Amino acid sequence: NSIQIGGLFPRGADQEYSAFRVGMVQFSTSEFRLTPHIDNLEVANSFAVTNAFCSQFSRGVYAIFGFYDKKSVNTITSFCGTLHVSFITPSFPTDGTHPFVIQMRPDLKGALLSLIEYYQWDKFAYLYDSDRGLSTLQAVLDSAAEKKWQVTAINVGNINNDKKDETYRSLFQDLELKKERRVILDCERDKVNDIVDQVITIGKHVKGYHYIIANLGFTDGDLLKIQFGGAEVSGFQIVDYDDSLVSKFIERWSTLEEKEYPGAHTATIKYTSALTYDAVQVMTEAFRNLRKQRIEISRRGNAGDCLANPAVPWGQGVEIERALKQVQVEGLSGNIKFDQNGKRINYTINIMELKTNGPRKIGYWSEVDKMVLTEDDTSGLEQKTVVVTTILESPYVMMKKNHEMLEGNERYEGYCVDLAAEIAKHCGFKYKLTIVGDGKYGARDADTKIWNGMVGELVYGKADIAIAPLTITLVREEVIDFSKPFMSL
Amino acid sequence: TNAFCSQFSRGVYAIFGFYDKKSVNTITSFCGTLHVSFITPSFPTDGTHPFVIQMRPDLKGALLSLIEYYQWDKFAYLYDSDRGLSTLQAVLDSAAEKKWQVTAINVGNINNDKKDETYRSLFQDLELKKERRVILDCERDKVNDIV
Amino acid sequence: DQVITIGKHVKGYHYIIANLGFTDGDLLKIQFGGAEVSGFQIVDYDDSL
Numbered sequence: 001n002s003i004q005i006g007g008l009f010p011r012g013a014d015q016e017y018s019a020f021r022v023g024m025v026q027f028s029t030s031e032f033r034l035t036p037h038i039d040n041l042e043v044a045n046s047f048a049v050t051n052a053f054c055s056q057f058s059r060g061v062y063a064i065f066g067f068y069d070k071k072s073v074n075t076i077t078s079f080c081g082t083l084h085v086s087f088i089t090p091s092f093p094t095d096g097t098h099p100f101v102i103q104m105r106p107d108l109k110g111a112l113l114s115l116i117e118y119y120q121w122d123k124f125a126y127l128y129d130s131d132r133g134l135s136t137l138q139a140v141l142d143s144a145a146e147k148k149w150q151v152t153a154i155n156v157g158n159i160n161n162d163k164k165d166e167t168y169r170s171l172f173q174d175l176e177l178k179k180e181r182r183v184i185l186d187c188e189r190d191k192v193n194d195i196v197d198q199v200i201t202i203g204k205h206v207k208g209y210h211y212i213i214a215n216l217g218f219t220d221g222d223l224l225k226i227q228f229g230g231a232e233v234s235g236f237q238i239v240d241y242d243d244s245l246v247s248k249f250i251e252r253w254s255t256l257e258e259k260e261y262p263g264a265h266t267a268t269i270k271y272t273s274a275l276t277y278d279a280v281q282v283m284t285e286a287f288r289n290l291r292k293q294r295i296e297i298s299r300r301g302n303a304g305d306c307l308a309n310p311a312v313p314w315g316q317g318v319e320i321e322r323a324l325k326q327v328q329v330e331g332l333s334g335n336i337k338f339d340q341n342g343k344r345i346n347y348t349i350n351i352m353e354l355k356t357n358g359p360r361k362i363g364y365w366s367e368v369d370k371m372v373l374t375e376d377d378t379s380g381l382e383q384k385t386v387v388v389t390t391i392l393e394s395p396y397v398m399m400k401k402n403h404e405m406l407e408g409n410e411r412y413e414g415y416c417v418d419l420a421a422e423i424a425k426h427c428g429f430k431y432k433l434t435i436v437g438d439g440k441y442g443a444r445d446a447d448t449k450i451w452n453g454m455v456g457e458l459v460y461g462k463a464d465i466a467i468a469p470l471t472i473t474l475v476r477e478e479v480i481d482f483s484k485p486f487m488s489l
Numbered sequence: 490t491n492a493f494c495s496q497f498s499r500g501v502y503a504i505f506g507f508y509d510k511k512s513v514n515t516i517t518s519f520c521g522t523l524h525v526s527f528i529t530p531s532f533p534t535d536g537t538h539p540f541v542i543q544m545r546p547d548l549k550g551a552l553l554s555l556i557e558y559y560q561w562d563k564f565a566y567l568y569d570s571d572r573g574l575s576t577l578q579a580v581l582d583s584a585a586e587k588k589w590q591v592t593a594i595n596v597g598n599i600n601n602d603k604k605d606e607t608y609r610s611l612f613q614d615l616e617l618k619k620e621r622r623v624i625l626d627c628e629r630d631k632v633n634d635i636v
Numbered sequence: 637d638q639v640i641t642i643g644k645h646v647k648g649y650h651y652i653i654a655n656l657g658f659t660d661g662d663l664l665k666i667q668f669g670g671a672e673v674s675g676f677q678i679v680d681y682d683d684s685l
């Protein structure tokens with residue numbers, strides 16, 4: 001038979017409802033159909049969410065897809081926990097252990113705390129919009145004690161649309177006083193586009209500035225505005241476009257016309273829409289495991305009223321929750337596995353970074369491993385260090401008190417060692433001291449015509465410079481270049 | 490929700506009652522919609538909400554006056570979430586403006602079987618700066634657990 | 637548009653716009669940022685005519 005479900009969509013979730021219907025037609029199978037009843041409402045209103053939940057509950061559904069806000073999350077988790085209806089959601093994962101709520105959004109408290117340590121920040125601003133709990137602000141403040149962080153938290157989300165420019169430009173003038181160059185933008189797309197419009201306008205997208213965008217949606221804003229300028233911006237991505245399942249999806253996603261699928265004719269999908277697409281895979285695969293293991297369930301003749309007295313559970317509901325949490329699919333976001341609370345485990349968050357070419361994956365974060373860097377750090381560039389030849393003469397170069405205990409240039413001291421430090425500082429290179437193997441200065445054999453010593457290590461190619469007591473001679477400057485004498489004798 | 494609707498269906502003229510951080514949005518949305526004015530001793534709501542008459546005064550202004558009065562600039566702020574997080578934001582907004590170094594620690598996610606253990610882990614991270622000035626933004630029961 | 641995009645409308649930079657039409661472009665784009673821009677104007681809007 002077909003399976004009745006419900007949908008709580010916001011008024012403005014055009015792409016999310018478009019990606020919902022795309023996932024409908026792709027994961028449907030002749031055996032059973034997930035016939036929905038879609039309600040549109042505002043999710044910041046707990047009266048509307050109460051009234052729409054009870055319309056879905058009276059009209060016999062088996063699970064409710066939907067979104068919630070800060071205002072409605074406690075209406076949702078209470079109704080679903082009490083009436084044993086399951087709720088599947090792309091919204092923020094709840095702060096708690098709520099039954100009958102399956103969270104499709106992974107978590108980025110752990111990944112964001114790993115990335116601040118990776119850049120070794122210890123003083124930074126944190127701009128937060130309220131907007132979905134306040135739990136990531138609270139997670140960096142609970143860690144700021146034991147990680148030695150000085151965090152400047154600014155509420156950036158009470159701002160209205162007519163004093164927008166005046167509030168933000170006055171905001172970064174305050175941080176300018178404290179020399180804040182490191183900022184985390186814990187906002188969503190529409191708010192993070194407004195902030196990067198203002199950091200460009202007042203010239204804070206230049207070098208010296210670092211930005212971390214604490215979304216799961218790094219390449220969902222307009223990053224081409226801040227891509228040149230010099231500021232380093234970093235972020236997180238759960239939708240890897242360099243995967244086979246995603247690239248096959250973008251193929252059919254980009255060809256859709258924006259009359260039957262608004263917000264679809266493009267090559268990037270928002271992560272909340274990717275999780276809406278993945279949630280149809282999760283529901284369908286779980287209702288397939290419902291009819292597979294012969295657990296066959298009916299709703300009731302009436303479903304009663306949500307505000308019943310007493311409101312009674314229904315024993316089939318525990319099975320449906322347990323079936324929704326055993327799902328082990330692969331979706332646009334990666335591995336979709338839930339724990340017993342309904343929160344995603346075994347997931348991956350790609351740590352991106354904006355370069356002049358574009359956004360560049362510089363690693364990932366897994367729950368079990370940690371932040372894992374990926375293989376691209378081999379191709380940066382390096383300094384091209386300079387090999388410098390010396391010789392053991394006191395006091396020019398002579399080995400220090402502990403030869404073997406020290407490693408590198410620090411094995412050596414003397415006049416020419418202090419001279420090599422001064423030549424390198426003015427020219428601008430990095431050097432690696434090297435005693436000449438033959439332990440000689442350089443002379444030419446009458447038969448073989450081969451230059452020995454530090455001279456032949458410059459004539460033939462072993463070295464680039466010879467800082468030494470090396471006498472400026474006629475027969476030597478025919479084959480090498482001396483400077484003016486640093487010591488007359 | 491069920492008990493608001495039992496009194497809306499008995500037809501009352503106003504409702505006296507309490508709310509939590511979990512039920513504040515249920516109350517202010519129903520009373521804002523069905524016009525069933527709510528008189529409450531609970532915490533003042535974070536925003537402008539119609540048909541809610543709030544008998545508890547406020548404390549954000551009196552608390553930021555007292556921090557300035559003692560000339561505090563480095564302190565710990567131990568909070569509990571149950572009255573919202575409005576006063577945490579108020580001392581964090583005023584810390585940016587006035588160069589305070591607040592250590593905000595959520596002390597309300599602590600249960601009865603991990604009290605003596607995590608409280609010693611609490612007061613350990615205070616000794617990393619040797620915090621001597623502590624604000625206890627909890628209610629009566631939790632402030633006795635800390636004292 | 638390009639000096640904003642690559643961050644050269646910040647302090648330290650000075651620009652002279654050699655038109656007779658200073659307030660005929662979009663100067664509100666570069667007005668904050670810190671760069672000093674200067675120019676010329678033959679049409680004084682603070683005149684009676």
Ligand SMILES: O=c1[nH]c2cc(C(F)(F)F)c(N3CCOCC3)cc2n(CP(=O)(O)O)c1=O
Pocket residue numbers: 393441442469470471472
């Ligand atoms: O370029 C040259 N620079 C040299 C520098 C020095 C030193 F003084 F140590 F710096 C000396 N020594 C002189 C005293 O006894 C120890 C070695 C020899 C050098 N020789 C070989 P020489 O001059 O033919 O004997 C060179 O060829």
